[PDB]
């Protein structure tokens, strides 16, 4: 009956359009900033010098780039991990000069990918659901804070960070096998394993419903005229998908169980981005991947190459290429 | 396939020859990796580039560097490229083993056998050492 | 270096650290044993 | 100055005074509802239901 | 029986596996 | 710049004190078993 | 003298790695035998201070 | 028949505890022996370099590519 | 008869002999840049 | 046939790339066996009794009380940074210096009483008093000559 | 068998610890048979450690973590970072490696033999979790042991030893730690600073006199800590937010000791006082202005004026400035100029870098100092080769910063993934339907159409 009470009453409805709840205190203002920032900075933004060298790289469409070439650059190396707000920039030109758009947009989206997730445990509490929903949201939620802040934090610099764009994304990707190794890193190929056997477990586990339907159409009608939302009944024989892929493959090596499968479908993407969070997380204090450069070695000593080696030439390609005008120093320490 | 020609290196500065044993060759590498690696990996210096391992830098300091026994008293007496005044302050040496406590346990033969790493890694990788990032 | 007195033992303690690592691997071989149930 | 250390980068006392209002001006609504609220009533749950 | 159809993957595994456990004491 | 500080200060306080006094708002007991 | 100590403290040790939790989780083991696992609790207890004694006697 | 009531039986056992160390030992001895690098054309370690040949053998024919494998593989 | 956990105690400990030999290989003899 | 090395026990052992050859691999005994380097008996080329090394200890000794001189004319300015910076930059090597010419236990005690006094310097011009750096400059200096003048 | 199958218990055996939870006697002995394996690691690895030392290395090219943390305390360790006896560290070890076989037998005895509940014949440490006053002894107890540890790192620095102070006049050595900071603006402007650069929240205390006041208020707070959630019971406001169940404990332990994680992370990555670069390496920012300082000491000898030396870009190719305008290191480097190590702090004025001083006073020492930091970057890959993912394989060297940042932050992750599942679970087990939904009575369904 009190002001607040009905404040919270409101906050907390299931029967709004889209629940808010208190996390989306937190969620709706931090990323309507972030997207607001974002859609301005990435139309038009003056060019970033990121490398802190007075070399501004342009990223917004009316200074010349497309949908594909443009991005929000990353902070100035010359900041580097320090707070660059815009009351501490002594002009807007200033802060735009030095990539402060891309702090802003970082700092509020990852502010506001947490209220989401705490927003997704929220709603399940308030619908009576299990709660577990938001850990599996944790795993992109992890890798987006591994590119975004942690990345940032074990190089020292905002500069090393994703950049919010197309090509920007391939430039983090490139400079990173070069400095990192990440391609012979084990937690990129345990999250190589959660893509590709995602994808794969989706799309079987999405033949297998759709081989198995049980007849409620005609064929000038579509498919998914059988179901009824609300229904009670199953909508596909899985008796009969059970025991296409217990043939398919052999017999114990098929779930009959759905419900161990679909926890199946929910843990092999989710482990898997979480294990290769920590490796972009672990190489950004520079453990890095697997180094086999010239270790076949023959009888004389000399230096018989393998494909890591061959793999080790392509990465000094992008390493003597990368930042070119940035390094006075024969090692790239940062 | 290391034979006794390979393992032939120059032992002085009148050009005397003499070939190391397998045992020369495997302590002299391990040796060489924990003593002097940290900055001479490959045959480069990587505090000072200008100054490198290959043999033809070390045929180009004053006091000539390509024998066994001037190698082993550049690692007692360090001196700088035109050999005129002393480096042993900032270079790992017997001179300064007070300094840097890696020098403290090492005999002739350890001095040897690190000499023995430095003239016989060109012999087998000869553009490799102390040719850096290129011939990686 | 272990003390003087200690160095016979220098073959144990290189195996001391990866106890831990059998004790998690016991309590899969106790449930084994016991079926799982 | 942002390297320099303050604290909740308060560095101008209108900073303090924006946090002190902007923090009691919600408490001092929750007091709408949670003050007059007796201390000494208990539960032996896991989760009270108590008033609203 | 379908004894020929394990053992045409256990077979060369345990093979190769023997090989591949003789290789690790190969040096130079 | 100190009076945009001032504004986000004001903005920041505001909404964390929601989410704080919020979750205090005897919010376990805000499932649908019971209350 | 120590390093016969010591050997003999990690023999004892793995004898009370392996009996131990088998008198214990046995369901009547350990009321009947715990006089005579108290005992090698004591020479094992005694074992330590006596290699501390000579370890420091011998610094 | 169950999979796992054929290897706790004992009888597996005796089949397989003579079959199985005798296809790891002779595995073992396809190695030993060097018998796979002649079957294969693996370098030993010693042959990956010759006295007349100090470079990385390439095949650059296509038609005589066995025979100008047998002039890179006769030292 | 024999207790299936006892088979996947021998079995695992060969697993883990095997994969200690190949991870020793690493280290030692090809492939170990010695 | 390739050249087998089962861990040292069973073929060569004494090749090039065999890792677990512990210390069989060469003849001269290993400080232990997880090291690459031989003891610090004799046979090694470094002498700690050897004049070079006293004479390089000394100079540190005898450089830091010019070091330690100059400390008030930073006092009667204010140059703060300047006390402290002197302390560090050529006298990091003091404190390596004097433990190594303590043998003694009277030199020892002397020499803790010479860096109590430096560490009140440090203290005192961090807290920029500037009475107190003076009086724990010039119990640095005596304590500094009574340490010396042992030998 | 009874609480011991799924039949009984409803848990699996994958979740099976999870049977654990309202069972006090068995949950006692799984904790301290747990603390006995924590205490029985701490005794092995470190005796590990001592076995496979050699002195001719440093501690940090080794692959050590422990030694250092015995070091910094004061033990076996001499000035500059040289470690003297490590008779100390192999103390250390055996009386961590015998008092978990004290630990590791109360572990089992309490797990195996002991009474399975405490609250019928052991009323003091009976409990049930809904019990909030009960729950607050428990905290109250355990917060004055911490509090007591705390000022045993304050007796070890006043009293016994002293601790390594990297900072010492004369060189870094042990020193007894006489004037500790105890002002709260000090103390407490770290605990309420910023997170971010030049501001570094709780890493950047950079004295040891700021450390041990820093653990004199730990253990001042801890222990009137103690004694309030001793004496007293929650309040209302406490009572309506949390869930009072053995789950939701965890969970909030799970979020506490997650935030610590990625904090002891950072201070191995960042801090070099608390965690010295003579023991574990150079920091990250460390080595790269030991490069910057490195070539601009070669290029001085070369008659370079380095002052005014421009470079590609047009910046200072070694000195440039910050963008505060203080003189620091120039190249990529520039972004690691809050940097304060203890061998370029003696060429420091209050503008930054004094240009005097590296022109005349440059000490040999300290281009000793930056070449080996230079070439032992926290820099290397898995399997241990030194250096950037380039490199060839001769050196073999990972940092022990780099070994225990990468570590702590990969757990503090998965440890903030276990709040997350624990403090769902326990929210909605408290609610009653984290088995599922209802079928007769499903909340959705009493709702109105959402549009
Ligand atoms: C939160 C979850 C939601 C995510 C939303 C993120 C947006 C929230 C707002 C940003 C919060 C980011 C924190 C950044 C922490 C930081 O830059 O951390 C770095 C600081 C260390 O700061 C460094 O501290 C250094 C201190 O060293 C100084 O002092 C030392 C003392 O010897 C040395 O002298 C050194 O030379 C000298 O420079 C310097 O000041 C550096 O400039 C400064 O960067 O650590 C710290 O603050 C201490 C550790 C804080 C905890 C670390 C959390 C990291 C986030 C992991 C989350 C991943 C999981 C997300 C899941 C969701
Ligand atoms: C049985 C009891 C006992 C214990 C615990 C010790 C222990 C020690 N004695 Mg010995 N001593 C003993 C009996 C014992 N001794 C006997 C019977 C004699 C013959 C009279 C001696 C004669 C003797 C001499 C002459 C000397 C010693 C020394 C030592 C120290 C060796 C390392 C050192 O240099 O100290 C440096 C200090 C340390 C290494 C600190 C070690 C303690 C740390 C903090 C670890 C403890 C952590 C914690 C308790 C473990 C967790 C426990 C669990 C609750 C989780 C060590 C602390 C030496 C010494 O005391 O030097 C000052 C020494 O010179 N002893
Ligand atoms: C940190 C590791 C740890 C610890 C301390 C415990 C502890 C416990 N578990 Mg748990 N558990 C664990 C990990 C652990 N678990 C893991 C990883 C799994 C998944 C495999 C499980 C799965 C699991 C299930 C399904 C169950 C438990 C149960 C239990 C409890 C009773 C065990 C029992 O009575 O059976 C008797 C056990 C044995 C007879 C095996 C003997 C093993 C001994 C202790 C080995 C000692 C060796 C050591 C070297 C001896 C040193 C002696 C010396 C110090 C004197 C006990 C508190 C039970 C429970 O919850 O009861 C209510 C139960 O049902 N656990
Ligand atoms: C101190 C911290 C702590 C404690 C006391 C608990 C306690 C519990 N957890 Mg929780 N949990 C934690 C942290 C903790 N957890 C963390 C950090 C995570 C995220 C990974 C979780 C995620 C989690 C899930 C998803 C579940 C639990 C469950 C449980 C309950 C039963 C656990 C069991 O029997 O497993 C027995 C142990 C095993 C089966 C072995 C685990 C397999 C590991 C990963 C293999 C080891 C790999 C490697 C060697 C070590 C990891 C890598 C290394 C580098 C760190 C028990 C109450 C269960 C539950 O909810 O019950 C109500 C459950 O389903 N926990
Ligand atoms: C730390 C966790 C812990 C807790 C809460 C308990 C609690 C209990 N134990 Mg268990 N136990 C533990 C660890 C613990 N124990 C350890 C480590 C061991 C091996 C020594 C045992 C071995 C053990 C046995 C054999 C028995 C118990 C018994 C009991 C129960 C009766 C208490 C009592 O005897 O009177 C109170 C005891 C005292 C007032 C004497 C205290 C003396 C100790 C040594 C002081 C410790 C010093 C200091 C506080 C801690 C230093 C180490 C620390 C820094 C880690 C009680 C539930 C009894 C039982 O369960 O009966 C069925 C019983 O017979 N315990
Ligand atoms: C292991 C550490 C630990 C843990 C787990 C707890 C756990 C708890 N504490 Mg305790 N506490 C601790 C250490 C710990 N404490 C220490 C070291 C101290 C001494 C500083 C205290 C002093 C203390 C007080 C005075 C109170 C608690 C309370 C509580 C309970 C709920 C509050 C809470 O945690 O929300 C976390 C909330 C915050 C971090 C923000 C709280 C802001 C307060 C409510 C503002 C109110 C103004 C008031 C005058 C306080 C002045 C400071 C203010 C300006 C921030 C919870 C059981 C509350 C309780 O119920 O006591 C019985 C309570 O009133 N603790
Ligand atoms: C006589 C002479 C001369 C002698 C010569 C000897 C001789 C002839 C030798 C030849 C022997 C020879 C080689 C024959 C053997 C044949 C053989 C096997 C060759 C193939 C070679 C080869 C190595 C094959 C291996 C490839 C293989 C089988 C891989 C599959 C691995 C595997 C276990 C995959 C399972 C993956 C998995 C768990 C997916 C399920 C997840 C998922 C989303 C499922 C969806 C799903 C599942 C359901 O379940 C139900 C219900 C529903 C709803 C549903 O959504
Ligand atoms: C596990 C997850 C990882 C945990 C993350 C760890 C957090 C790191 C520790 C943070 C330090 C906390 C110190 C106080 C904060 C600080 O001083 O920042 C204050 C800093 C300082 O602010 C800057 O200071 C500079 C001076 O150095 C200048 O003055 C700048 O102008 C000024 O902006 O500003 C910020 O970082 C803003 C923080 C915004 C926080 C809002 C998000 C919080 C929402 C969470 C909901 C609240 C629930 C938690 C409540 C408990
Ligand atoms: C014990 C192992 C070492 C050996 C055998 C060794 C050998 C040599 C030799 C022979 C030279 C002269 C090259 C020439 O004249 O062309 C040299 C130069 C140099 N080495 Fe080393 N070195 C060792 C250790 C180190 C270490 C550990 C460092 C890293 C701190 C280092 C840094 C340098 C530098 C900077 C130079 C250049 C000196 C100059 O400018 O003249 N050396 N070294
Ligand atoms: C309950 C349970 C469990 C657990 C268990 C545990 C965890 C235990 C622990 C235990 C422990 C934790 C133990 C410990 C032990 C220890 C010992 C036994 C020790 C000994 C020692 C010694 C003997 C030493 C010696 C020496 C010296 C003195 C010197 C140097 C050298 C040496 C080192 C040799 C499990 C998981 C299974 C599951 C089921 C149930
Ligand atoms: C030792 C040392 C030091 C010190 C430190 C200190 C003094 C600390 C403190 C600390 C502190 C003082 C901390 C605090 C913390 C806090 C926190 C962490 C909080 C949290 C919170 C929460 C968790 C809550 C939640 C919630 C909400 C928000 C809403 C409602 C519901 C709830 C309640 C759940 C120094 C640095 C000087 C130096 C070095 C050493
Ligand atoms: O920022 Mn982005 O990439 Ca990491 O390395 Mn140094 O810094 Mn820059 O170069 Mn390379």
């Known amino acids: 009956v009190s002001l607040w009470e009905r404040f919270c009453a409101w906050i907390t409805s299931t029967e709004n359009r889209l629940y808010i709840g208190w996390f989306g205190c937190l969620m709706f203002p931090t990323l309507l900033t972030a997207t607001s920032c974002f859609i301005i900075a990435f139309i038009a933004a003056p060019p970033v010098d990121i490398d802190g060298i007075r070399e501004p790289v342009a990223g917004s469409l009316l200074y010349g780039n497309n949908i594909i070439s443009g991005a929000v650059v990353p902070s100035s190396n010359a900041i580097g991990m320090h707070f660059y707000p815009i009351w501490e920039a002594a002009s807007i030109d200033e802060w735009l000069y030095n990539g402060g758009p891309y702090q802003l947009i970082v700092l509020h989206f990852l502010l506001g990918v947490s209220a989401y997730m705490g927003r997704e445990w929220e709603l399940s509490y308030r619908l009576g659901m299990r709660p577990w929903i938001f850990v599996a949201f944790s795993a992109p939620v992890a890798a987006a804070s591994a590119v975004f802040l942690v990345y940032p934090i074990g190089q020292g610099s905002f500069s090393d960070g994703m950049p919010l764009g197309i090509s920007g ?38 033949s297998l419903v759709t081989s198995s339907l049980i007849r409620e159409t005609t064929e000038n009608e579509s498919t998914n005229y059988g179901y009824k939302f609300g229904q009670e009944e199953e909508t596909y024989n899985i008796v009969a998908a059970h025991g296409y892929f217990g043939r398919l493959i052999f017999q114990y090596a098929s779930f009959n169980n759905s419900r161990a499968l679909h926890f199946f479908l929910a843990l092999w993407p989710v482990v898997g981005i979480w294990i290769t969070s920590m490796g972009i997380s672990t190489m950004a204090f520079n453990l890095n991947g697997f180094n086999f450069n010239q270790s076949v070695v023959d009888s004389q000593g000399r230096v018989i190459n393998t494909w890591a080696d061959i793999l080790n030439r392509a990465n000094l390609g992008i390493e003597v290429m990368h930042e070119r005008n940035a390094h006075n120093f024969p090692l790239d320490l940062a | 396939d290391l034979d006794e020609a390979t393992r032939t290196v120059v032992v002085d500065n009148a050009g005397n020859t003499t070939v190391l044993t397998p045992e020369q060759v495997k302590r002299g590498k391990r040796l060489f990796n924990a003593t002097c690696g940290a900055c001479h990996v490959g045959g480069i210096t990587k505090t000072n580039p200008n100054v490198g391992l290959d043999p033809e830098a070390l045929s180009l300091a004053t006091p000539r560097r390509d024998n066994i026994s001037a190698l082993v008293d550049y690692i007692k007496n360090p001196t700088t490229y035109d050999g005129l005044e002393s480096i042993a302050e900032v270079h790992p040496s017997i001179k300064s083993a007070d300094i840097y406590p890696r020098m403290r346990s090492l005999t002739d033969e350890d001095l040897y056998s690190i000499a023995g790493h430095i003239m016989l890694s060109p012999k087998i990788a000869s553009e490799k050492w102390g040719g850096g990032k290129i011939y990686y | 270096r272990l003390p003087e007195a200690y160095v016979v033992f220098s073959p144990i303690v290189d195996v001391l650290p990866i106890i831990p690592v059998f004790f998690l691997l016991l309590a899969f071989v106790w449930q084994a044993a016991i079926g799982f149930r | ?20 209002l902007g923090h009691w001006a919600i408490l001092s609504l929750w007091l709408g509802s949670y003050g007059d609220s007796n201390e000494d009533e208990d539960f032996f749950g896991e989760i009270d239901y108590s008033a609203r | 029986f379908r004894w020929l159809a394990i053992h045409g993957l256990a077979i060369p595994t345990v093979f190769f596996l023997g090989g591949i456990t003789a290789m690790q004491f190969i040096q130079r | 710049m100190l009076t945009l500080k001032i504004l986000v200060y004001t903005t920041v306080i505001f ?21 | 003298m120590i390093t016969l100590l010591v050997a003999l403290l990690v023999l004892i040790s ?4 392996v009996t131990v939790p088998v008198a214990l989780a046995t369901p009547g083991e350990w009321e009947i035998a715990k006089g005579k696992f108290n005992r090698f609790f004591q020479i094992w207890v005694f074992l330590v201070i006596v290699i501390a004694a000579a370890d420091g006697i011998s610094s | 028949r169950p999979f796992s ?25 396809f190695i030993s022996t060097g018998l796979a690098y002649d079957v294969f054309g693996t370098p030993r370690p010693n042959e990956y370099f010759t006295q007349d040949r100090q470079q990385v053998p390439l095949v650059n024919d296509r038609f005589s590519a066995k025979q100008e494998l047998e002039d890179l593989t006769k030292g | 008869r024999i207790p299936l956990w006892l088979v996947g105690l021998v079995g695992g400990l060969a697993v883990i002999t095997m994969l200690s030999l190949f991870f020793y290989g690493s280290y030692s003899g090809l492939g170990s840049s010695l | 046939s390739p050249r087998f090395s089962v861990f040292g026990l069973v073929g060569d052992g004494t090749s090039y790339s065999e890792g677990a050859a512990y210390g069989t691999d060469q003849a001269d005994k290993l400080y232990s066996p ?44 204010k140059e703060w940074f300047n006390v402290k910076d002197e302390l560090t930059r050529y006298m990091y090597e003091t404190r390596g210096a004097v433990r190594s010419l303590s043998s003694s236990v009277t030199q020892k005690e002397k020499a803790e009483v010479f860096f109590r006094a430096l560490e009140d310097t440090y203290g005192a011009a961090t807290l920029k008093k500037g009475d107190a750096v003076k009086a724990s400059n010039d119990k640095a200096i005596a304590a500094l000559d009574a340490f010396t003048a042992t030998l | 068998i009874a609480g011991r199958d799924i039949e009984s218990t409803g848990f699996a055996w994958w979740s099976g610890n999870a049977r654990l939870i309202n069972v006090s006697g068995k949950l006692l002995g799984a904790h301290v048979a747990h603390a006995g394996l924590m205490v029985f690691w701490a005794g092995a690895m470190v005796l590990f450690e001592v076995s496979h030392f050699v002195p001719e290395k440093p501690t940090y090219e080794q692959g050590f973590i422990l030694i250092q943390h015995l070091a910094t305390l004061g033990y076996g360790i ?56 009960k729950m607050t002894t428990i905290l109250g107890i355990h917060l004055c042991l911490l509090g007591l540890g705390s000022f045993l790192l304050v007796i070890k620095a006043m009293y016994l030893g002293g601790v390594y102070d990297t900072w010492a006049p004369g060189g870094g050595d042990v020193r007894y730690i006489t004037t500790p900071t105890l002002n709260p603006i000090v103390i407490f402007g770290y605990v309420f600073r910023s997170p971010f650069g030049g501001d570094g929240w709780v890493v950047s205390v950079n004295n040891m006199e700021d450390v041990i006041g820093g653990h004199i208020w730990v253990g001042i707070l801890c222990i009137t800590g103690g004694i309030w959630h001793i004496f007293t019971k929650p309040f209302a406001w406490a009572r309506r937010a949390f869930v009072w169940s053995g789950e939701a404990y965890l969970s909030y332990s799970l979020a506490a000791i997650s935030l610590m994680g990625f904090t002891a992370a950072l201070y191995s990555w960042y801090n070099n006082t608390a965690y010295p670069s003579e023991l574990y390496g150079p920091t990250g920012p460390e080595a790269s202005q030991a490069q910057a300082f490195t070539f601009l000491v070669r290029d001085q000898r070369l008659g370079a004026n380095v002052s005014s030396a421009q470079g590609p870009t047009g910046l200072g190719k070694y000195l440039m ?45 300290q281009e000793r100092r930056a070449a080996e930091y230079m070439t032992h970057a926290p820099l290397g890959s898995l399997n241990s080769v030194g250096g950037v993912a380039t490199e060839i394989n001769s050196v073999n060297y990972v940092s022990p910063r780099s070994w225990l940042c990468c570590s702590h932050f990969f757990l503090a992750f998965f440890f903030l993934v276990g709040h997350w599942w624990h403090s769902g679970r326990a929210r909605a087990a408290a609610a009653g339907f984290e088995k599922g939904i209802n079928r007769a009575n499903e909340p959705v369904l009493s709702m109105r159409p959402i549009d």
Do not use: C
């Open chain 10, 34 to 77: 997880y090291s690459v380097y031989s003891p610090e008996g004799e046979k090694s080329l470094y002498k700690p009794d050897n004049a070079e090394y006293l004479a390089r200890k000394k100079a540190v000794l005898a450089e830091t009380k010019n070091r330690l001189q100059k400390i008030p004319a930073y006092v009667d300015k």
């Open chain 4, 1 to 20: 100055t942002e390297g320099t250390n303050e604290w909740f980068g308060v560095d101008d006392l209108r900073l303090l005074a924006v946090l002190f």
């Open chain 7, 14 to 17: 793995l004898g009370l790695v």
């Open chain 6, 15 to 35: 909404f964390v004190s929601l989410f704080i006094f919020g979750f205090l708002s005897s919010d376990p007991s805000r499932n649908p078993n019971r209350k």
């Open chain 11, 78 to 133: 001499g000035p500059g970072g040289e470690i003297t006896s490590t008779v100390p560290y192999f103390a250390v070890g055996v009386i961590h490696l015998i008092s978990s076989a004290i630990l590791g037998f109360g572990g089992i005895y309490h797990s195996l033999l002991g009474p399975d509940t405490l609250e019928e014949s052991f009323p003091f440490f009976g409990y049930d979790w809904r019990d909030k006053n």
């Open chain 1, 169 to 206: 994304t391939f430039n983090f990707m490139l400079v990173f096998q070069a400095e990192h190794n990440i391609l012979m890193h084990p937690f990129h190929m345990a999250g190589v394993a959660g893509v590709f056997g995602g994808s794969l477990f989706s799309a079987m586990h999405g």
């Open chain 8, 5 to 29: 009531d054929i290897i706790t039986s004992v009888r597996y056992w005796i089949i397989h505890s003579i079959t199985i160390p005798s296809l790891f030992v002779s595995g073992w001895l």
């Open chain 11, 321 to 365: 400035r910050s963008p505060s305008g203080e003189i620091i290191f120039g190249g990529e480097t520039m972004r690691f100029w809050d940097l304060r190590a203890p061998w370029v702090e003696p060429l420091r004025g209050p503008n930054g870098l004094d240009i005097n001083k590296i022109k005349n006073d440059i000490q040999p020492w």
